[PDB]
Design a protein around this ligand. Structure first.
Ligand SMILES: Nc1ncnc2c1ncn2[C@@H]1O[C@H](COP(=O)(O)O)[C@@H](O)[C@H]1O
Ligand SMILES: [Cl-]
Ligand SMILES: [Cl-]
Length: 643
């Protein structure tokens, strides 16, 4: 593939160049020079060379990384205090500080868990279901899996019971690991899954009455079912495992399975993308899209069931950084947390960018004043958010997993004063592009394929359009126990069919348009990329979330609009008034974005209850789950069409 390079091949497939990445290397140097924490977190090139020695097993390179960085802080989690009220009841409360686990302590805990589990009869090749958010304990379980040679199955916490149990039926795990938050759901699925011999409970504080009561109920229910099963805290497994015989070394075969990452298509049937040893190793050896070498204080806010949660976690550790956990699965502590973390690197998803923009808009509305213009006030607010909310040390930032509007790219770059990288990739393919430019490696080949029923052709003007298809060094081997499904997503020439419509701006230079299945045809022949519309309309200060909906029988669009709480409160006493103001705001967004008139929803339902991951309307990446939204709002929307 070096021999398919041309003079038109972007350097950006390799290197990011402009006069200023001397200015960023300087700006990085400045942030480091008044910050003792950051000095000690630069990557060690001796540890990197050991980790990248060719021919290493995955456990050997994991060992060289974790033992190599030693007592360096790896994982930061918010400290907790046990509060015992005057009645005797004890709760766990967060403290306003973080504490850390070192690289070698992570390794020691992993080896202890593997020893304890092996003594409990768990073996290399067993599947391990894991139900939780993302946390230090979860990271310990993940590395423990690599050490024992099991297959991690991180389950989506918002998935239906029926589908979770079917995944359990298919993987027959011998271990079910659950954070205390999700223990009741765990017991339901353990009772349905007789293969489980061990229930391992993590993120667990037994001195808190509620955690203690959750565990007693677990033991009560599993005993009533007559289940022979070991119920064991991760903390005690670690304590006891420190003194037990070492687990045997795990299988060495690079193709041995180590992780499944589930994903759903338009059918809503999850399928498990297989991650073998060699593909897991890629996550730990190569940070997605490095702008340049920086001390890495990162933020984990995405679940371990999603690739993006692994990109921040293993990306940060790969280069000797410290990865800090958001303390709430619903992100309610997000801004309190990052103000304490003060990260140097943030990998956003669009939903979280939209939350930051809303925070800014609400602060602006509260700060309006006759003696300064909105732009003047907005500038001061951005300084404050950049310095106080984000910590003032953000040096690298980016977004991926879903499209991000040009307006939000510009806003985040202005707010954070860094370039906002756009990272496109998938669970299946791995990393595919950076700011539109195909990354070679791992990508080796791409093409676009016409989608004539959506009006996309490689001969379109000004840009070729069609479905992106790719070959890549990090292409997954397939979906677990779904060979026909896997064959179905590779075309006759072996290209992976991304299901994404793109435009080719230039050789190796692409623009995301939408999912094939997201594009709607209106009655008169127009085609609409709904997720672009949703990204634009969400930017209205009145709008918190939006779901755009159409019917090919109709000439126009509808939507479901969740207003911001500030908007609802401002018109609480004038109910009639909010809907026409939202409509006018959509019209104005459309004119600013140069959208066509058919791209403007002509009516909508006002929803006061935001879509959530817990409700199944949002994916664990907080993207819309369109079949679930059409399942939920479809009758009302068609009734809005019909009358
Ligand atoms: N930077 C990105 N920009 C636009 N869309 C993205 C980006 N990253 C992922 N997507 C979408 O997310 C899909 C992968 O989702 P998943 O396999 O569940 O992680 C891709 O096929 C795209 O549709
Ligand atoms: Cl379902
Ligand atoms: Cl003004």
């Amino acid at each position: 593939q070096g021999m398919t390079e041309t003079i038109s091949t972007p350097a950006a497939t390799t290197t990011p160049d402009l006069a200023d990445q001397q200015e960023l290397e300087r700006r990085v140097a400045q942030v480091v020079s008044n910050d003792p924490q950051l000095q000690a977190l630069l990557p060690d090139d001796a540890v990197s060379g050991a980790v990248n020695e060719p021919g290493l097993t995955l456990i050997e390179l994991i060992r060289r990384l974790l033992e190599g960085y030693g007592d360096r802080p790896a994982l930061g989690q918010r400290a907790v205090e046990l509060v015992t009220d005057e009645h005797g009841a004890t709760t766990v409360a967060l403290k306003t500080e973080f504490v850390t686990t070192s690289y070698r302590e992570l390794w020691n805990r992993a080896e202890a868990i593997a020893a304890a589990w092996y003594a409990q009869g768990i073996r290399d090749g067993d599947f391990v279901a894991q139900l939780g958010f993302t946390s230090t304990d979860f990271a310990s379980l993940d590395v423990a899996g690599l050490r024992l040679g099991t297959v991690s199955v991180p389950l989506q916490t918002g998935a239906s019971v029926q589908q979770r149990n079917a995944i359990l039926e298919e993987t027959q795990p011998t271990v079910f690991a659950a954070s205390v938050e999700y223990l009741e759901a765990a017991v339901d699925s353990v009772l349905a899954t007789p293969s489980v011999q061990l229930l391992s409970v993590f993120d667990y504080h037994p001195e808190a009455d509620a955690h203690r009561a959750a565990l007693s109920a677990v033991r009560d229910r599993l005993e009533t079912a007559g289940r022979t099963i070991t119920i064991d805290s991760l903390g005690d497994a670690i304590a006891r495992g420190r003194e037990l015989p070492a687990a045997p070394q795990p299988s060495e075969d690079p193709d041995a399975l180590r992780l499944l990452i589930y994903t759903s298509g338009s059918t809503g049937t999850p399928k498990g993308a297989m991650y073998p040893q060699w593909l897991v190793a890629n996550l730990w050896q190569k940070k997605w899209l490095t702008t340049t070498v920086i001390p890495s204080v990162g933020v984990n806010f995405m679940p371990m069931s999603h690739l993006a949660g692994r990109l921040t976690l293993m990306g940060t550790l790969s280069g000797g950084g410290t990865a800090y956990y958001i303390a709430s699965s619903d992100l309610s502590t997000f801004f309190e947390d990052i103000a304490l973390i003060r990260p140097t690197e943030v990998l956003f998803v669009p939903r979280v960018v939209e939350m930051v923009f809303q925070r800014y808009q609400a602060e602006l509305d509260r700060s309006l004043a006759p003696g300064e213009s909105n732009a003047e006030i907005a500038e001061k607010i951005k300084v404050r958010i950049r310095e106080e909310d984000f910590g003032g040390r953000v040096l690298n930032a980016g977004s991926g997993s879903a499209p991000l509007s040009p307006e939000m790219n510009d806003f985040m770059e202005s707010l954070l004063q860094v370039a906002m990288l756009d990272g496109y990739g998938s669970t299946e393919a791995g990393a595919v592009w950076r700011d539109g430019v195909l990354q070679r490696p791992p990508v080796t080949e791409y093409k676009l394929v016409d989608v004539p029923e959506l009006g996309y052709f490689t001969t379109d003007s000004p840009h070729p359009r069609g479905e992106l298809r790719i070959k890549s060094e990090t292409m997954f081997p397939g979906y677990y126990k779904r060979p026909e499904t896997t064959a179905d997503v590779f075309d006759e020439d072996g290209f992976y069919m991304t299901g994404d419509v793109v435009a080719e701006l230039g050789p190796d230079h692409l623009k995301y348009l939408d999912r094939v299945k997201n594009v709607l045809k209106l009655a008169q022949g127009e085609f609409v990329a709904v997720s672009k519309l949703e990204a634009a309309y969400t930017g209205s200060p009145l709008v918190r979330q939006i779901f755009v909906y159409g019917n090919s029988e109709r000439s126009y669009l509808l939507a479901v609009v969740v207003p911001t709480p500030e908007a609802l409160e401002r018109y609480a006493d004038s109910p009639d008034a909010l809907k026409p103001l939202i409509q006018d705001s959509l019209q104005q967004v459309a004119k600013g974005a140069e959208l066509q008139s058919y791209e403007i929803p002509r009516d909508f339902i006002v929803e006061t209850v935001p879509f959530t991951v817990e409700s199944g309307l949002l994916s664990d990446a907080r993207k819309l789950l369109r079949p679930k939204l059409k399942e939920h709002y479809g009758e009302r929307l068609e009734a809005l069409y019909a009358d």
